[PDB]
Design a protein around this ligand. Structure first.
Ligand SMILES: NC(=O)c1ccc[n+]([C@@H]2O[C@H](COP(=O)([O-])OP(=O)(O)OC[C@H]3O[C@@H](n4cnc5c(N)ncnc54)[C@H](OP(=O)(O)O)[C@@H]3O)[C@@H](O)[C@H]2O)c1
Ligand SMILES: NC(=O)c1ccc[n+]([C@@H]2O[C@H](COP(=O)([O-])OP(=O)(O)OC[C@H]3O[C@@H](n4cnc5c(N)ncnc54)[C@H](OP(=O)(O)O)[C@@H]3O)[C@@H](O)[C@H]2O)c1
Ligand SMILES: NC(=O)c1ccc[n+]([C@@H]2O[C@H](COP(=O)([O-])OP(=O)(O)OC[C@H]3O[C@@H](n4cnc5c(N)ncnc54)[C@H](OP(=O)(O)O)[C@@H]3O)[C@@H](O)[C@H]2O)c1
Ligand SMILES: NC(=O)c1ccc[n+]([C@@H]2O[C@H](COP(=O)([O-])OP(=O)(O)OC[C@H]3O[C@@H](n4cnc5c(N)ncnc54)[C@H](OP(=O)(O)O)[C@@H]3O)[C@@H](O)[C@H]2O)c1
Ligand SMILES: O=c1c(O)c(-c2cccc(O)c2)oc2ccc(O)cc12
Ligand SMILES: O=c1c(O)c(-c2cccc(O)c2)oc2ccc(O)cc12
Ligand SMILES: O=c1c(O)c(-c2cccc(O)c2)oc2ccc(O)cc12
Lengths: 240, 248, 247, 249
């Protein structure tokens, strides 16, 4: 049985990814930063289905002198639990506005660029160095119609498109595929967003995102590398 | 009942693999073909041996002309006549040959290249929608932005198909119809291409230094028509082994 | 010694502005038109009063048909016949109207795909066969967030991006550059109520206004200039940031 | 009163070409430089000899650090200190080297590649906007960012982030009348270290003329974007690549 690392797996999209990979037959490393209770609750549910198939791993993914070691630790944890590491899902993300005109700004850089781009880079290095192997990066379908005042966030998501493509090229000789899934929209403010989605009749779910990840790690995607699949209900096609 | 799909240019290569994989999934299929009647009929025989009454053939030229609308309406009508429903449309048929800018008539080249690649998909899409997990899949080209030299009209047609995929995804979403694309890089090489040229192409692909099988292309089509893609519309999935990422 | 340019759909609006600015820059111009004969002639008369023997008109339907190749060959030949050379081609003419998925549809195809794509393709072939040479295609900045029910128009504009790129690649060895200018919202329809024009104007980040024809023309003048000698295959958005705005 | 521009990494090569052409157009210029002090001063002397009191130098490391925000505020402040205004910012300075995924610390590489290429442009854009007519920012991008060189992941990440900044800042700064655009070279001046044969390998790939862009040709696109002939253009990235990005493998 193969093994997968999912970053930010305690909640929301990462949790759904971890569940679906587990349902597919993977052993999973559930990475978390602050959500230890939720991480361990998930691992408890998964291990009750199949014993010793889920572990947790704590790491802050903010950029800092120690982030490379932290990322090597996450990958190492998968090898120590399971003896292998077939899949890496870069799901963890920080998200908040950083206006250009008026935490320090450099802490924002560390958290937005670090979590969203540099940690994926370092995880990707550690994953490859230790080697159907495939990395999936959680991108953003709205990368080229960005939210107002989200410059740093958007820079980091752009940088992650760059990583996806550069790592796809560079790791292809090692048989490692590298792809992305780009959610769009995944309560008055929540309804405003839902009514703009062309496929709005359906509610967006974490499960839907997870379905795309499962496709890309599967044997049905064996020739796919460097691809980013939008899972956005058509929202990125909608003009202002 | 079992859902039903139309696959254009289904007698051979990628279209044939799509038809087979849809039929293995549970769909009843219309095997559209233009010249390859023996292959189309042999495929329908094979599929019907596995399940009776689950495949039919439909012949049509998809070159643009004043009767193309009627031809495309007839292909969708053929699926309703055989199966009583039409759930999936795969726009696979394509003309492909060079049209140099500097030295068949050029109008015939337009009709064939733009017709098969773009206008026939558009008209099929209109007829599919009008006749109503509904979904259209367009076979695009991952190398559309790094085109082969002297293939202007082909490239124009494949860009127009990207436009149709996006415009139809937007317009048809209220009707429950998803519209997506699959973009091969190099898959099955042309029957006419020489051995040495085939190898040159295969050596460029980062992922394995080989072309995609037809079945690998079909696998992406399968995903996009499946319930695991219910929130995906307007997306074009490259299935190219990294080839579009490789600089000159 | 003065260079010459063909501008399609040049009687009015953006094409007229382009023609004027090329003339101001020193080009002799072919003013192509379809229905707008009085406006095309008034422009040519205006430009020839500024400098004699610097403007002609050429009428043609750019709808696709059996005869479109010969029409496009004629348009290019008209520049050589008047001016002895053809340095610049600007593919500006365009049909634009909705074609809902749910005039015959084949006439719509001929018009929308012809004007926006096939005529540019044929003009490009005739331009190159007859040879700072450069083609500029008028594209659409909103081609990836299209208007609802405009599929044929959007198909046509996407095909023109493909032509721009394919032609840039193939014509580079002949020294011919091929680029695009992609407006967002520029001159609004004639009949459109101010209330409706203002809904579009308020979307534009940059000044909450549409581009003037002149501002589109300025990008065309840049691309044909010596300041753009290394630029080919590029499409310059002239959209005030409109394509960057989410739903 | 003549307008004023800041050009990062302006002592040599493309940055020098941009500073020169902005000066020739009538701008007063801040020539930012990190290590090329003798080249920066030689350039400022040449410009000042053409028109007195129209060029100054400004030294800064654009590596990311906790002081980078102050450094970037000081670069902008230097233009107001010399000239009393700052109309144009050209983000040109760039670190460029390979960072292979499979085997300077990697943190230092991050700080240098992502700092120069992305974070410093972001901090400079914040400081330019805060200190505020034809105001505009031009970011030096990379036409090949989608067909990247092997083993240049961090560089490519930084250039992709710069695309994002160009678009996000165009959107946010448009209400203030500040336009934000890019110029994306393909191959222009080849690296100083590169041998002739390897330079020719790159040259032979370019459709338009089988040669690299001159520095002047890159600067031409920057001058257009900062001109009144680009007054409606914001969020646009102009490729200046001779067709290179269109060439398949
Ligand atoms: N929701 C959407 O609509 C949407 C749209 C576009 C893109 N996406 C992308 O899809 C992925 C998942 O989205 P989501 O909404 O599920 O994400 P989310 O809940 O915003 O964040 C997922 C997890 O990231 C982890 N994380 C945040 N900062 C961290 C740090 N400094 N160190 C380590 N881990 C950290 C957190 O884990 P702990 O709770 O353990 O601390 C958090 O629960 C993300 O990459 C996101 O950018 C989502
Ligand atoms: N193979 C590749 O590497 C590759 C690369 C990029 C994109 N693609 C795209 O993927 C799809 C499948 O590729 P493929 O190589 O399998 O295609 P193909 O063998 O070139 O063509 C598929 C079929 O199209 C039909 N077709 C051609 N002209 C037609 C016309 N005028 N009217 C009706 N049908 C016509 C033919 O049917 P009959 O045989 O019945 O006459 C032909 O067998 C195509 O859309 C293609 O553009 C393929
Ligand atoms: N205005 C905008 O906001 C905007 C937005 C995006 C893209 N664009 C593009 O920018 C260009 C200029 O826009 P515009 O608004 O100035 O264009 P326009 O007024 O819509 O059309 C320009 C001219 O095209 C000619 N034309 C139409 N159908 C023709 C046919 N069948 N045969 C030959 N010529 C035909 C007409 O010439 P006659 O009058 O002589 O018949 C017309 O005056 C076009 O390519 C357009 O698609 C404009
Ligand atoms: N040349 C090309 O073909 C090409 C291709 C694609 C993109 N570009 C882009 O176009 C721009 C100009 O290219 P170029 O070749 O002229 O650039 P370059 O010579 O590689 O670099 C320009 C300047 O960047 C400065 N720089 C480097 N690290 C720095 C740091 N840590 N702090 C502050 N400044 C630093 C250096 O200043 P000092 O010398 O003063 O230390 C250097 O002279 C760059 O943004 C580049 O990425 C160029
Ligand atoms: O058979 C094809 C082919 O191999 C290739 C192909 C071969 C080499 C390189 C490439 O980018 C495509 O393109 C096709 C496009 C359309 C079509 O209908 C068939 C082919
Ligand atoms: O006049 C036009 C127009 O205002 C617009 C337009 C109006 C509102 C929003 C928009 O994105 C474009 O588009 C056109 C496209 C082609 C053409 O030939 C003319 C127009
Ligand atoms: O000098 C450079 C260069 O020639 C090239 C270059 C050389 C060959 C191919 C290519 O696509 C770029 O890229 C650079 C990118 C950043 C930078 O700061 C300088 C260079």
């Amino acid at each position: 049985a193969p093994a997968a690392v999912v970053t930010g797996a305690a909640k929301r999209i990462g949790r759904a990814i971890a569940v679906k990979l587990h349902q597919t037959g993977y052993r999973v490393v559930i990475h978390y930063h602050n959500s230890a209770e939720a991480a361990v609750s998930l691992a408890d549910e998964l291990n009750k289905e199949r014993s010793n198939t889920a572990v947790v791993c704590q790491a802050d993914l903010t950029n800092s002198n120690v982030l490379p070691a932290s990322c090597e630790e996450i990958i190492n944890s998968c090898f120590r639990a399971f003896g292998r590491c077939d899949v890496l899902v870069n799901n963890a993300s920080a998200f908040y506005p950083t206006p250009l005109v008026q935490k320090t700004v450099e802490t924002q850089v560390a958290e937005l660029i670090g979590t969203n781009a540099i940690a994926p880079f370092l995880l990707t290095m550690s994953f490859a160095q230790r080697q159907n192997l495939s990395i999936v990066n959680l991108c953003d379908a709205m990368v080229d119609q960005p939210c107002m005042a989200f410059s740093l966030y958007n820079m980091g998501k752009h940088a992650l498109v760059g990583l996806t493509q550069s790592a796809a090229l560079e790791l292809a000789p090692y048989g490692i595929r590298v792809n992305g899934v780009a959610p769009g929209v995944s309560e008055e403010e929540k309804d405003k967003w839902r009514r703009k989605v062309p496929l709005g009749r359906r509610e967006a779910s974490a499960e839907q995102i997870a379905d795309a990840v499962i496709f890309l790690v599967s044997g049905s995607a064996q020739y796919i590398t460097g691809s980013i699949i939008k899972v956005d209900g058509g929202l990125s096609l909608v003009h202002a």
